[PDB]
A paper describes a structure:
Leucyl-tRNA synthetases (LeuRSs) are examples of aaRSs that rely on their editing domains to limit misaminoacylation of tRNA with near-cognate amino acids and maintain the fidelity of the genetic code. Here, we identified epetraborole (EPT) from the MMV pandemic response box as an inhibitor against the essential protein leucyl-tRNA synthetase (LeuRS) in M. abscessus. Benzoxaboroles were shown to inhibit LeuRS in fungi, gram-negative pathogens and most recently M. tuberculosis. To gain insight into the interactions between EPT and LeuRS, we solved the crystal structure of the M. abscessus editing domain (LeuRS303-498).
AMP acts as a surrogate for the 3’ end of the tRNA acceptor stem. In concordance with the binding mode of action of benzoxaboroles, we detected strong electron density in the active site corresponding to the EPT-AMP adduct formed through covalent interactions between the boron atom of EPT and the 2’ and 3’ hydroxyl groups on the ribose ring of AMP. In addition, R435 (R449 in M. tuberculosis) hydrogen bonds with the ethoxy oxygen of EPT and packed with the ribose of AMP. EPT has a hydroxypropyl ether moiety, rather than the ethyl ether in the benzoxaborole bound to M. tuberculosis LeuRS, but the extension shows very weak electron density and likely does not contribute to binding. The only notable difference is a ~1 Å shift in phosphate group of the EPT-AMP adduct. In both complexes, the phosphate is pinned between Y421 (Y435) and T323 (T337). The electron density indicates that there are multiple rotomeric conformations of T323, meaning its hydroxyl could hydrogen bond with the phosphate or with the 3’ O and ether oxygen of the adduct. Comparing unliganded and liganded residues in M. abscessus editing domain structures shows a sizable shift of residues 416–422, located around the adenosine pocket, upon drug binding, including ordering of Y421 to interact with the EPT-AMP adduct phosphate, and a decrease of B factors in the neighbouring residues. From the structural data, we propose that EPT binds LeuRS from M. abscessus and M. tuberculosis in a similar manner with similar affinity, providing a shared pathway for future structure-activity relationship analysis.
Author numbering: 304 to 381, 389 to 498
Write the structure that this text describes.
Amino acid sequence: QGASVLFGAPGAGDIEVFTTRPDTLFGATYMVLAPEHPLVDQLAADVWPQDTDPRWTGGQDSPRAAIEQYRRSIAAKSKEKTGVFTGAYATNPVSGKPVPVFIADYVLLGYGTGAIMAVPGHDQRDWDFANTFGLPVQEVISGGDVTKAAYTGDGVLVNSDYLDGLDIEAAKVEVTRRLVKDGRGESR
Ligand SMILES: NC[C@H]1O[B@@-]2(O[C@@H]3[C@H](O2)[C@@H](COP(=O)(O)O)O[C@H]3n2cnc3c(N)ncnc32)c2c(OCCCO)cccc21
């Protein structure tokens, strides 16, 4: 079933996410917090990082500016995917890779922890946001074509280290076991 997963981020402690597909953790290429999530102000960087995409900034000169205008954007005129980058990168808890942290109103503050891991290869909501904003799309479930659409079907784990070859249900169990031993999550 589901899991609580911890993504460490510099200066912000852990960002906890709820996922029903922990098996897809090696395909989590970014993270999304609800715009009013309390850690966002802590996460905002002082300077857009080098590899910030201009589509990520709301056209603003700094992370805090983009965040403020995006929040303001949610009040005015309060569909398509919108959001901004915070400047922050969290540590993926199974691969160690950097995952950029966004805010976007498709993530509800009041559901779960108010934060998700985003797996565009296998969640069409995340696929849509990644295709609008230009985020990497990683296949970890064999069976479709993640360059055309999220693959939500059954298949075997790939590009996922000790999960490779596992069926999805077995992969959920194994990744959760590893998260528990590593202090990085639990079943929920
Ligand atoms: N996103 C990557 C991975 O994780 B998913 O997305 C999170 C989390 O799992 C899921 C939790 O929904 P349920 O409690 O009903 O089970 O919704 C999403 N979610 C959790 N909290 C959220 C929030 N606050 N706001 C918006 N979405 C949220 C997920 C999928 O969800 C399919 C089920 C959607 O109803 C399918 C494939 C891959 C995944």
